[PDB]
Amino acid sequence: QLIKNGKKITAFVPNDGCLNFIEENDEVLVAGFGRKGHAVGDIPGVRFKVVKVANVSLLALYKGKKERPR
Amino acid sequence: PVARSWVCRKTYVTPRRPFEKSRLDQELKLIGEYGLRNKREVWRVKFTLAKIRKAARELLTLDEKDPRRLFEGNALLRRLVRIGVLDEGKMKLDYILGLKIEDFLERRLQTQVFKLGLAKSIHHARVLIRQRHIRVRKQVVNIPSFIVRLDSQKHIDFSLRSPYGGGRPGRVKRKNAKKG
Amino acid sequence: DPYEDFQENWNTKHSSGVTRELMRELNGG
Amino acid sequence: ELSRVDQRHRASQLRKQKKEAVLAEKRQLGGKDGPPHQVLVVPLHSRISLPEAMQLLQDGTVHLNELGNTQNFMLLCPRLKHRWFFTSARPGDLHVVLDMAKVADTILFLLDPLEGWDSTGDYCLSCLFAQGLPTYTLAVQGISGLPLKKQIDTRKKLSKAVEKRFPHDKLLLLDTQQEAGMLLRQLANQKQQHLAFRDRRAYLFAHAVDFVPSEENNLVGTLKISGYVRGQTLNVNRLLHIVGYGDFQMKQIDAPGDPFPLNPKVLMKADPGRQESLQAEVIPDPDEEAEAKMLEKYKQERLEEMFPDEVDTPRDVAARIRFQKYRGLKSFRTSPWDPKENLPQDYARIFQFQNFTNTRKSIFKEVEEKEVEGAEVGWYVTLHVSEVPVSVVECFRQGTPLIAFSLLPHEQKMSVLNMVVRRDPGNTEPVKAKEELIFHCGFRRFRASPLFSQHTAADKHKLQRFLTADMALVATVYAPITFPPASVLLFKQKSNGMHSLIATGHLMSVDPDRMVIKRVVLSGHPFKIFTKMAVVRYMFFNREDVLWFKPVELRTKWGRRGHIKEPLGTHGHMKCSFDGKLKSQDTVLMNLYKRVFPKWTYDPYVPEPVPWLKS
RNA sequence: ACGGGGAAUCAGGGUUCGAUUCCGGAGAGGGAGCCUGAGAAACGGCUACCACAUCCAAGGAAGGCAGCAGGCGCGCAAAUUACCCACUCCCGACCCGGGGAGGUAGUGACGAAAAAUAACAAUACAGGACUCUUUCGAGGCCCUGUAAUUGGAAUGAGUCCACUUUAAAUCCUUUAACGAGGAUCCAUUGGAGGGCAAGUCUGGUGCCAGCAGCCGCGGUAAUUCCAGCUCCAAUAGCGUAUAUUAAAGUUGCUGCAGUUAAAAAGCUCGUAGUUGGAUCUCUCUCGGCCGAAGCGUUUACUUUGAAAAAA
């Protein structure tokens, strides 16, 4: 649920084991998926993907460079 | 308001197609032949040639008795003779279009240190320039892509403070003399 | 043999790879 | 939107909407009326002695309220006209940190110039992040004590070695009080992180504890606890929980004069018997041998991460006797299950809800949307409690403070709490499904024996017999009811009473209706395969129990569904139809399921941990 | 949507951006009215009202950061409450005082320029090439390395006296002294099916987890997932998201299409618009023959001139 206008959004948590860095009510920077507001092939009606959770990067958590802050 | 100049300019263009064999091959042959570091040193000398071809290709539409073609076209050939890329008998404006990348890469200070015999390889010239062993007429030059002009080719030497020409030995020889 | 592996596997999942390998054999350097 | 002026107006309303809602909670803290600006200060690196820095920030007017060991004082500098309050603690000590950094408004970290933190400060840093961090600010002490060149590197050789804990923050150094004068302004104008737990309950901090016993032979009496009220309007007919010594009911509140006003005895409430709720948790009406355990716990754990529940089938006792109690589910998520078929006798000792969310929104509204006749916040109210033992008194003279906070209705009885944990990767030791662990569930402290479970949305939940390092698990235990949300910590004594932090997380819904299910997998082997039939050796041994477990569906390790068709051996063999053709590599196995209930090993007493060091 | 000078891209034509340091406009929370003065409807002036909001002893008093810093809020999104009038200039009675104009530092991978992370030599190879031997095999003749083989010679990065720089400092430039052998003083970011450079190698998983812009991959031999090795591309930089430009002759003036792929109005009349067939070969009143003054029906076109801010 977006901060700046209240709108709601389903975003895709990309790599494997990357839902396991997220809990509920967390603050998430979301990007586009790459097709400029259209869905990306396999996923139906999903136009966004998670970039950062809890002000740390997902590529930093997946590759183990950093720790999930609580 | 500030007293600063923001006038800058990029000195290279990247190709339109990134993964193209025999572009990759030809530039790797030009990297290995002339001791260059990365592709961007070929794309830089491709860019100054493309500026010289383009300005001559503009000057070839004006007629032979144009003012601008006679002035600015004689000043284009003068620089290309001066840096030693063209010769003197080929100063029509149509032997500009027969120039290549290798003519411009033979005039760097690196290949000239190799050509004069002050080095023994094209990678030995890069270090001998970069370690500050090479001077041009009085002045230590620290840059390998220093395009050597035609009059400054006869004065390239070994930098009177260096262990190679001057004589005071380096860091290593003096410590081994201390351990003697 | 790129000829046989192309003539067999031009229809399968490995078609693009065997066409790549066959052009590599034919063109050559 | 429509036409440039009803768009500029439409922005102005929503700008005014947001800009006024951010102000309705700013006056919760540190006004001129002044519930004092509590600032907890801890050093991370043990090179940093804490009396080095606190003397420098002492002087506006200093009021040294004396404590046991640490100097926990209050500050007034009226050139900016604010009332600060400074408490101080030590790294690694779980006792003196976690009890007053929970009611604090601000934490002030003191980092060393050289490194970021030692190993022991990283321990209490991990518990504070999971407890719920208030407003925090970095600080350093020895920057200008380095040479005039070697200080512009030392902030720069530090501030990237902090970001794997602290992603972005400036570092306010401490060398002077003119350096600290820029700290108290930065301390004053922050963004106030609102701890979501404390803004529904009325809490307090101990400034001076006084005691006189009713009788001396029974070693229990009545306390005169004094301190500011800092929560909501403190009702008199609510209960009172000291964070380390259980729950009880007080008998008298009274507001004396404020000993520390910003700019320089009446009894008002008494407890009746008609409104005061009764205190009962239940319904009244009805070395190398452990190393031998340790080496197998590096192995019996590892029989779970490669085999799900591969047990051995019983060769001696019959299969309708050893696995009598279980059952087979046709589909683990879409099966019917009566949630009250076999209630244990412990479930006749717990309390139920008609609808937990709708009774939460009615008890959430009354503290905020309804005004009660209790004492309002910001006051200085001392307090007479009824019956607390003498042991809480002299430990305050050692130096630890005692924190008491009010409770909501239905927060003193017993129910079945479900709580989400994630295993902290700082510990590497395995934990059984029914161990004894130290729980810190939202200002409480107790030992318990949980049931680890999986975190799904369906009604059934499969028991995980151990603790994994990546899946988020749910603990389930009998405990007193704490209304959500509540931050959870889990500890375990490794040796010498050192508490090893193993799991963090938050709270799910407290209810007994969560079905946690213990599985058992019966593995067999097919040894004569046919065209869509199979002869399965070793799964059973008798002939008769094959007709017992005939309706229980079968599965294989390669995804094939099947079922028992007939038996053919007088020994334990059977015929089983299948859907695909079985492979020679397969291992057909069936699943048996039953309900499971946790143990009642609740105790409100926790041993006080030692200073946590390394080994 | 502040406008221009301009900026990005670009064969030629074009398209899009231009809040932003120069010129011009406007405005100091929102409207309104004035005083003074050569000049203001002035806000680092005043008087009201509407909106916020500070002190108060409750009678009163004072406000306006879209100046420089700094704070909160907002948000994907942006630096120090630093030093100085020495420079460039401005104001004043003034060679003297003042200037958050401006300069100097700090933060700063916005972006642009140069550019290290090794060079060389002697051995040996079941390495290649050049002369001979039919061939075995004969050589400092030229090259190469999965030699963590040996060997000194060269050097910065750092550490650091001094000078120099500057208002005073820093930085760079110049020099002492120390400063390299796994020269551990280790280079990263994406990838290896095709588009598109580069492995149907090995282990794991088994339409799961996941990958994949697109096509597709994964159901027990996965060229594609998770990894190990190896290889590739750019390289102190490289991925991702979004805006935009080319690719797009997929907006078409150059330069598209309209039977069947999307598309010609049911037919005809008709005003505006747009477009329209041949044809036609410089002189009068004056000044010293050379200048005035007039033209001829009026224009479009083309060529020259002069005027077009600097950057």
Side-chain angles (χ1 to χ4, degrees), chain A, chain B, chain C, chain D residues 2-5 7-368 370 372 374-607 609-615:
Chain A
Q1 178 181 56
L2 284 200
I3 282 171
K4 62 181 175 184
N5 41 4
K7 286 181 180 182
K8 307 212 182 203
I9 272 174
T10 324
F12 172 70
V13 185
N15 296 275
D16 56 350
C18 275
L19 209 74
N20 305 346
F21 305 121
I22 313 180
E23 287 271 10
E24 276 202 338
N25 294 138
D26 220 354
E27 204 193 44
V28 166
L29 178 81
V30 198
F33 216 114
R35 275 193 101 172
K36 305 171 263 186
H38 272 87
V40 159
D42 190 62
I43 321 168
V46 161
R47 325 178 161 209
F48 308 98
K49 63 176 167 194
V50 166
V51 172
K52 298 209 295 197
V53 292
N55 202 1
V56 306
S57 192
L58 272 196
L59 191 75
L61 298 168
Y62 171 85
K63 284 155 72 189
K65 299 172 158 286
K66 284 163 159 207
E67 287 174 351
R68 160 76 191 275
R70 307 138 304 266
Chain B
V2 281
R4 298 166 179 158
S5 93
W6 319 288
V7 39
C8 60
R9 173 182 303 254
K10 205 185 265 188
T11 52
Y12 72 103
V13 190
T14 76
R16 280 184 194 107
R17 299 164 163 250
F19 305 116
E20 169 174 277
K21 203 84 183 303
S22 272
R23 189 204 95 231
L24 291 171
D25 272 329
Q26 177 217 351
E27 281 166 339
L28 189 52
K29 291 199 185 201
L30 275 149
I31 278 172
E33 183 182 354
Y34 291 112
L36 318 170
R37 175 182 39 182
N38 49 11
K39 285 289 216 288
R40 211 209 286 117
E41 301 199 352
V42 186
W43 300 342
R44 176 170 78 208
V45 188
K46 270 187 196 175
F47 192 36
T48 83
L49 176 83
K51 276 171 176 157
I52 288 168
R53 297 191 91 255
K54 175 254 302 174
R57 211 175 62 203
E58 179 265 333
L59 287 166
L60 281 184
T61 64
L62 319 176
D63 49 345
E64 283 89 353
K65 296 169 295 191
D66 214 85
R68 174 172 207 251
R69 183 190 193 266
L70 281 171
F71 182 83
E72 183 184 328
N74 276 352
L76 181 53
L77 298 150
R78 199 195 73 87
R79 313 199 273 94
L80 295 180
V81 178
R82 188 193 193 202
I83 59 182
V85 170
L86 273 172
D87 60 83
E88 298 256 14
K90 275 197 165 192
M91 273 195 283
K92 294 187 203 168
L93 204 59
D94 284 355
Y95 311 113
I96 289 189
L97 300 191
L99 296 177
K100 283 209 69 180
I101 306 300
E102 300 98 27
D103 269 333
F104 282 79
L105 280 161
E106 285 265 328
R107 299 314 298 166
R108 300 169 91 233
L109 183 50
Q110 177 176 1
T111 87
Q112 284 302 311
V113 159
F114 181 46
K115 280 319 168 198
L116 267 69
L118 314 177
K120 47 212 309 181
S121 196
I122 200 60
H123 309 273
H124 190 41
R126 188 97 172 197
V127 291
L128 284 190
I129 289 173
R130 202 54 188 145
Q131 314 296 356
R132 315 153 96 250
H133 296 298
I134 294 296
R135 68 170 159 89
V136 182
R137 301 203 225 199
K138 206 52 73 184
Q139 164 92 34
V140 178
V141 186
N142 205 27
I143 277 90
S145 71
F146 175 98
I147 282 172
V148 177
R149 287 176 179 139
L150 215 48
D151 48 70
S152 43
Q153 196 179 343
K154 283 97 202 175
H155 321 270
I156 291 176
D157 275 315
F158 259 116
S159 159
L160 309 161
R161 286 288 303 246
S162 71
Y164 280 65
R168 180 201 140 94
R171 208 211 296 185
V172 192
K173 183 168 260 180
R174 291 188 285 105
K175 198 215 268 199
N176 286 22
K178 290 312 164 310
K179 286 170 178 40
Chain C
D1 199 47
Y3 287 82
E4 186 219 347
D5 268 17
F6 174 76
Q7 283 182 193
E8 292 299 318
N9 313 278
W10 71 275
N11 225 334
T12 56
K13 161 184 163 181
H14 288 244
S15 60
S16 42
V18 297
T19 319
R20 184 264 312 268
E21 294 299 313
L22 180 57
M23 296 291 163
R24 280 184 138 152
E25 217 270 344
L26 288 176
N27 284 8
Chain D
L2 263 297
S3 89
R4 183 256 158 294
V5 179
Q7 318 183 20
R8 191 81 169 268
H9 185 242
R10 199 203 154 277
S12 75
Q13 314 182 260
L14 298 177
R15 187 171 63 239
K16 194 54 201 193
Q17 170 261 330
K18 275 183 161 177
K19 271 168 82 96
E20 74 209 359
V22 304
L23 219 50
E25 324 97 334
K26 196 180 282 304
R27 291 293 100 215
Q28 197 196 179
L29 210 164
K32 195 261 176 183
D33 51 357
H37 186 59
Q38 168 75 256
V39 174
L40 179 132
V41 58
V42 296
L44 316 182
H45 209 277
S46 298
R47 168 167 31 84
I48 314 160
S49 178
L50 197 51
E52 298 165 330
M54 53 81 72
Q55 45 90 38
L56 169 75
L57 67 93
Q58 278 179 356
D59 177 36
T61 47
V62 180
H63 288 97
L64 288 198
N65 181 267
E66 284 289 331
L67 271 294
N69 309 334
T70 80
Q71 188 56 251
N72 297 93
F73 75 105
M74 193 282 303
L75 181 140
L76 295 170
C77 199
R79 306 289 294 175
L80 179 61
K81 307 104 193 174
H82 291 108
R83 184 193 315 179
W84 283 269
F85 190 78
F86 292 113
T87 41
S88 317
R90 284 314 180 108
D93 188 353
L94 198 167
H95 216 78
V96 310
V97 164
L98 218 74
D99 63 327
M100 59 167 197
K102 53 161 56 77
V103 303
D105 310 275
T106 318
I107 306 192
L108 212 172
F109 297 117
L110 302 183
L111 283 59
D112 59 305
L114 275 68
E115 273 93 3
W117 36 73
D118 52 357
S119 50
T120 171
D122 204 2
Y123 172 79
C124 55
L125 193 48
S126 55
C127 317
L128 280 169
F129 266 77
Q131 197 185 10
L133 264 166
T135 65
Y136 50 93
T137 312
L138 318 179
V140 287
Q141 52 95 9
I143 316 297
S144 169
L146 300 171
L148 195 49
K149 312 164 301 309
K150 302 300 133 186
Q151 44 96 42
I152 209 63
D153 324 278
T154 305
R155 190 190 290 116
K156 292 283 220 75
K157 305 285 131 48
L158 182 48
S159 316
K160 270 71 64 184
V162 66
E163 288 176 348
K164 294 168 296 164
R165 280 294 216 184
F166 279 76
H168 69 86
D169 265 329
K170 315 162 180 44
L171 282 92
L172 299 208
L173 70 102
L174 272 295
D175 205 291
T176 83
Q177 61 208 51
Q178 307 272 109
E179 215 79 60
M182 316 295 158
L183 158 65
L184 260 64
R185 176 181 176 266
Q186 180 69 33
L187 196 70
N189 305 326
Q190 293 268 103
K191 177 165 53 189
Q192 288 316 297
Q193 275 286 286
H194 289 311
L195 262 282
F197 178 76
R198 327 174 309 191
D199 55 320
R200 311 173 195 277
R201 303 147 173 84
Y203 60 98
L204 180 152
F205 172 69
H207 288 248
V209 192
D210 185 21
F211 179 71
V212 45
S214 60
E215 318 89 350
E216 197 39 78
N217 44 6
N218 53 5
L219 277 303
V220 57
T222 171
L223 273 300
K224 323 299 162 266
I225 178 57
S226 56
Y228 286 87
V229 60
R230 294 175 171 187
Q232 292 275 357
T233 170
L234 197 167
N235 192 303
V236 59
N237 265 288
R238 299 294 167 84
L239 271 301
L240 192 52
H241 174 83
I242 276 290
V243 302
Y245 295 95
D247 198 82
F248 36 77
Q249 179 47 52
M250 37 64 56
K251 71 216 173 201
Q252 191 47 62
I253 69 153
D254 46 350
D258 312 338
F260 298 128
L262 190 41
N263 303 90
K265 64 221 281 183
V266 173
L267 276 298
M268 81 302 293
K269 308 301 160 253
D271 298 62
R274 42 89 180 170
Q275 187 94 320
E276 185 46 63
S277 64
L278 171 142
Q279 286 84 65
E281 310 106 349
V282 310
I283 307 98
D285 184 273
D287 53 355
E288 274 308 319
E289 52 277 0
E291 182 49 61
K293 199 72 66 67
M294 165 59 148
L295 59 90
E296 69 98 27
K297 266 178 58 57
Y298 282 175
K299 277 303 293 166
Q300 203 184 359
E301 163 207 351
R302 290 308 308 195
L303 319 183
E304 301 316 287
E305 279 87 6
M306 44 205 66
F307 298 150
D309 196 359
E310 281 213 342
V311 306
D312 192 27
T313 170
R315 299 211 291 277
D316 41 9
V317 60
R320 72 191 64 85
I321 305 309
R322 174 60 197 84
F323 292 144
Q324 197 294 325
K325 320 302 297 292
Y326 298 86
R327 79 183 62 165
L329 297 158
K330 298 282 101 175
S331 86
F332 189 51
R333 295 157 61 188
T334 80
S335 51
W337 201 302
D338 187 311
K340 57 183 72 65
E341 47 203 21
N342 286 171
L343 67 91
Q345 274 325 290
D346 293 331
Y347 275 0
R349 224 164 77 187
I350 56 149
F351 279 71
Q352 69 270 341
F353 288 80
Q354 63 272 17
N355 183 291
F356 184 77
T357 297
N358 275 344
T359 195
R360 186 180 66 166
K361 69 175 305 308
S362 46
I363 196 156
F364 275 2
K365 211 195 308 291
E366 52 84 21
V367 58
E368 313 278 44
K370 193 279 170 185
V372 308
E376 203 35 74
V377 301
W379 293 31
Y380 190 80
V381 190
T382 193
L383 171 44
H384 317 272
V385 299
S386 57
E387 211 59 29
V388 187
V390 311
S391 45
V392 305
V393 180
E394 69 288 339
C395 51
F396 173 74
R397 311 302 145 88
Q398 306 321 102
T400 178
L402 271 303
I403 300 308
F405 70 103
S406 88
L407 320 184
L408 273 303
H410 322 271
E411 284 222 341
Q412 311 90 1
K413 279 93 74 175
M414 278 318 170
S415 169
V416 182
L417 280 73
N418 316 327
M419 58 172 97
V420 161
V421 300
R422 321 226 55 179
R423 177 176 162 87
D424 193 320
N427 215 57
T428 60
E429 311 155 319
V431 175
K432 271 153 192 194
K434 281 186 171 69
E435 283 293 324
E436 201 77 344
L437 302 89
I438 302 96
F439 276 60
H440 300 242
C441 172
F443 279 38
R444 300 292 185 91
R445 283 166 73 177
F446 60 96
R447 267 174 289 177
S449 299
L451 281 196
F452 299 147
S453 176
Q454 64 159 335
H455 187 69
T456 76
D459 46 299
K460 265 84 71 174
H461 287 265
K462 174 185 61 215
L463 153 75
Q464 315 273 335
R465 287 146 169 238
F466 288 93
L467 212 61
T468 169
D470 45 7
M471 193 190 245
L473 310 104
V474 172
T476 307
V477 72
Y478 311 120
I481 293 98
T482 296
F483 262 80
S487 85
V488 193
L489 283 176
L490 258 68
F491 294 90
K492 182 176 183 52
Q493 290 98 4
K494 56 182 184 294
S495 161
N496 325 296
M498 303 154 71
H499 285 48
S500 62
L501 172 65
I502 62 176
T504 71
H506 70 91
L507 191 78
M508 259 178 57
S509 158
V510 46
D511 67 88
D513 291 332
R514 186 163 190 265
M515 324 275 257
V516 52
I517 294 295
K518 175 187 64 171
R519 81 184 307 178
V520 58
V521 158
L522 278 163
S523 58
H525 176 76
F527 88 127
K528 301 176 165 85
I529 321 175
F530 300 101
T531 55
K532 298 245 195 181
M533 296 295 269
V535 180
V536 179
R537 182 194 168 281
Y538 161 92
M539 173 178 279
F540 294 127
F541 282 81
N542 209 308
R543 192 175 180 257
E544 182 181 358
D545 54 47
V546 171
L547 277 303
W548 199 257
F549 296 95
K550 157 162 293 178
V552 180
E553 198 185 349
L554 262 64
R555 80 180 185 106
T556 75
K557 273 221 170 305
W558 284 35
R560 313 259 59 80
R561 300 228 82 85
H563 57 101
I564 290 181
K565 182 67 168 61
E566 324 277 11
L568 85 165
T570 283
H571 313 315
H573 301 285
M574 60 187 98
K575 293 167 55 96
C576 315
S577 177
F578 276 91
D579 54 358
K581 299 193 92 81
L582 288 196
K583 288 277 199 170
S584 180
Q585 315 203 12
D586 255 329
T587 297
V588 54
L589 45 90
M590 81 199 312
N591 309 308
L592 267 298
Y593 298 114
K594 84 172 291 189
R595 212 180 188 177
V596 62
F597 313 105
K599 304 162 48 49
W600 203 314
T601 81
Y602 175 71
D603 46 321
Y605 171 65
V606 195
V610 307
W612 194 92
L613 273 296
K614 310 309 301 304
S615 315

